[PDB]
Amino acid sequence: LYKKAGLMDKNELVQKAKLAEQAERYDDMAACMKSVTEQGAELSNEERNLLSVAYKNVVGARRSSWRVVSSIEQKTEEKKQQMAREYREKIETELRDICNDVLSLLEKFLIPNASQAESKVFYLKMKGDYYRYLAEVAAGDDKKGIVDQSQQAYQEAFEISKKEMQPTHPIRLGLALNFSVFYYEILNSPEKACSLAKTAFDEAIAELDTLSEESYKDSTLIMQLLRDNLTLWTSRSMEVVPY
Amino acid sequence: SLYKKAGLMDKNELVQKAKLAEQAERYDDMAACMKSVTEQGAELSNEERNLLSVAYKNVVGARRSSWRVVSSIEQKTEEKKQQMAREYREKIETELRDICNDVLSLLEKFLIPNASQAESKVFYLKMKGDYYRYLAEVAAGDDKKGIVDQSQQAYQEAFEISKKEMQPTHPIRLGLALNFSVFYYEILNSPEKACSLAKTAFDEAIAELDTLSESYKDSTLIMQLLRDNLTLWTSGSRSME
């Protein structure tokens, strides 16, 4: 504007994203973390975590709005129907922006800068998520193509994490959680879904001896969701966790 | 942006999308719709009036919560980090003032003048007192005295019309009482007038429990709120919804 290039230092940007979080202003938070990302430095686990939550909440709000409106779109007898149809489309657009914004960050910065496998797995999972959201809202011909960009990501994530990470690890567990949901809600393979969940859950249960006090609340919460899902698939406080 | 012809939305399509916005909790969209509707110059219907008030309570409510949250972090830091909390707080105060003002604007240039029945003038006069009161909540020394009095003089005029024209159990009269006492307590640090006003309003509505008939659950809801505030202020944390 007309400021003198006393821009915010990275440390300061992160202090703001935190402030923005406690103040329930996730647009601000996403913005602060997008900036930090763009500096090109590999993000610390804190920053990475912060970034993830920030966009979980931002994309999340729209997804809720899209589902409310897309529903109302269809509880219609005439003219009001396409009032809703357009509103939905405007929301789909907000969505695709946020999704593509994040997807960019993941391609141009986060995934290439990934040091240890744990981080690659992190960002690949993220990639599958936001490709998945595009898919949820994608057009007829595009969908099939979007939905397996989603799957390729989740998949590579899965493979690395099996070779390289403990099953009690929140990242591997959160990946499991969202992949099994992918198979279920996106591919309608409740069979492949249930397999992923149970295996993931069991292998973690197998090694609860190994789960550390520091990962404990997070991992067990994800395990609990995996298991709560399995009951349902047989017979969202996830927005505050990065995994 | 500029690439659109004046085939835009009429009052009905605007209102119809206000309601959708509300269902999808996009109170910004909703305030945009109702502002547009208000601006077309006609007196708002009751349905419309409500959509307007809801949308802006929500829009400004969000910023007020944010301000309070950041404002506390500022003080629980008795310290280079405090400066960032302070500046974020100021950025927020800005969003706040814009919102209050372009509402206060719709009230002077449209809503209050268009007000025909006594009941309507009370609603928008309280609304005026309400948003001057949010201004008052964040104002600095110099501007404050007058913002506060803008809030009071509005609350006041609304008060006398409501007592002279409506029933003690009329939720608007009841709701005016609620927010006027909050003014006194929180903005004027006049706790005895606040408590006295809350109690009176409550007592006179107690008297005429004749006047129902299902509004009703709208009347006793505010009555319960007046009691809570009265309890809070006289015993040893007020609510925001």
Return the exposure string of B159-174: e unless at least 16 CB atoms fall within 10 Å of the residue's CB, then b: bebbbeebbbbbbbbb
Element (H, E) at A135: helix A117-136
Show me where the domains of chain A are located.
Answer: 1-243
Cβ contact B20–A91 (<8 Å): no
**B122 CA to chain A: closest CA distance, Å?**
33
- Which amino acid appears at position B62 of this protein? A
Structure tokens at B76: 């629980």
Return the exposure string of B134-151: e unless at least 16 CB atoms fall within 10 Å of the residue's CB, then b: bbbbbbeeeeeeebbebb
CB pairs under 8 A between A and B: 50
Say which DSSP state A114 is in. -
Structure tokens at B107: 């009230």
Chain B residues with beta carbon closer than 8 angstroms to that of A16:
84, 88
Say which DSSP state A239 is in. G
Sign of CA dihedral A220, A221, A226, A229: positive
Question: Which residue in the set A15, A19, A65 is minimally distant from B24, CB to CB?
Answer: A65
Report the C-alpha gap between A7 and B216 in whole angstroms.
56
Of B84, B90, B95, which to mutate for an interface test with A (greatest number of A Cβ within 10 Å)? B84
- Which amino acid appears at position B148 of this protein? V
Element (H, E) at A196: helix A190-205
Neighbours of B127 (CB within 10 A): 25
Per-residue CA distances from A55 to A12, A51, B15, B35, B111 (Å): 19, 6, 31, 30, 39
Chain B residues with beta carbon closer than 8 angstroms to that of A24:
62, 65-66, 69
Q: Does domain B1-241 have CATH number 1.20.140.10?
A: no
Element (H, E) at A61: helix A45-72
Report the C-alpha gap between B241 and B237 in whole angstroms.
13
Decide: residue A157, CB within 10 A, 0-12 exposed, 13-18 middle, 19+ buried: buried
Ramachandran area for residue B140 (φ above 0: left; ψ -120 to 50: alpha; else beta): beta
Element (H, E) at A101: helix A79-105
Cβ contact A68–B23 (<8 Å): yes
Residue A1's SS3 state is: coil
Cβ neighbours of residue B7 under 8 Å, at least 6 residues apart? Answer: none
Complete DSSP assignment for chain B: --S--S----HHHHHHHHHHHHHTT-HHHHHHHHHHHHHT-SPP-HHHHHHHHHHHHHHHHHHHHHHHHHHHHHHT----HHHHHHHHHHHHHHHHHHHHHHHHHHIIIIIHHH--SHHHHHHHHHHHHHHHHHHHTT--HHHHHHHHHHHHHHHHHHHHHHHHHS-TT-HHHHHHHHHHHHIIIIIT--HHHHHHHHHHHHHHHHHTTTS-----HHHHHHHHHHHHHHHHHH-------
CB A57 within 8 A of CB A50: no
Report the C-alpha gap between B181 and B134 in whole angstroms.
14
Ramachandran area for residue A188 (φ above 0: left; ψ -120 to 50: alpha; else beta): left
Instruction: Measure CA B136 to chain center.
Output: 12
Report the C-alpha gap between B194 and B102 in whole angstroms.
28
Would you state the torsion angle of the CA atoms of residues B202, B61, B55, A67, taken in this order, to the nearest 10 degrees? Answer: -120
Instruction: Measure CA A218 to chain center.
Output: 15
CB B110 within 8 A of CB B39: yes
Cβ neighbours of residue B130 under 8 Å, at least 6 residues apart? Answer: B179
Report chain B residues touching chain A, CB-CB < 8 A: 13, 16-17, 20, 23-26, 62, 65-66, 69-70, 73, 81, 84-85, 88, 92
Report the C-alpha gap between A143 and A17 in whole angstroms.
34
**A47 CA to chain B: closest CA distance, Å?**
17
- Which amino acid appears at position B226 of this protein? L
**A76 CA to chain B: closest CA distance, Å?**
13
Q: A1-243: which CATH architecture?
A: Up-down Bundle (1.20)
Would you state the torsion angle of the CA atoms of residues A91, A96, A102, A105, taken in this order, to the nearest 10 degrees? Answer: -140
Complete DSSP assignment for B111-154: IHHH--SHHHHHHHHHHHHHHHHHHHTT--HHHHHHHHHHHHHH
Q: How many CA atoms lie within 13 A of A146 on its CB side?
A: 20
Complete DSSP assignment for A141-195: HHHHHHHHHHHHHHHHHHHHHHHHS-TT-HHHHHHHHHHHHIIIIIT--HHHHHH
Neighbours of A100 (CB within 10 A): 12
Decide: residue A217, CB within 10 A, 0-12 exposed, 13-18 middle, 19+ buried: exposed
Cβ contact B20–A64 (<8 Å): no
Method: X-ray
Place of tokens 């899965």: A158
Cβ contact A64–B26 (<8 Å): no
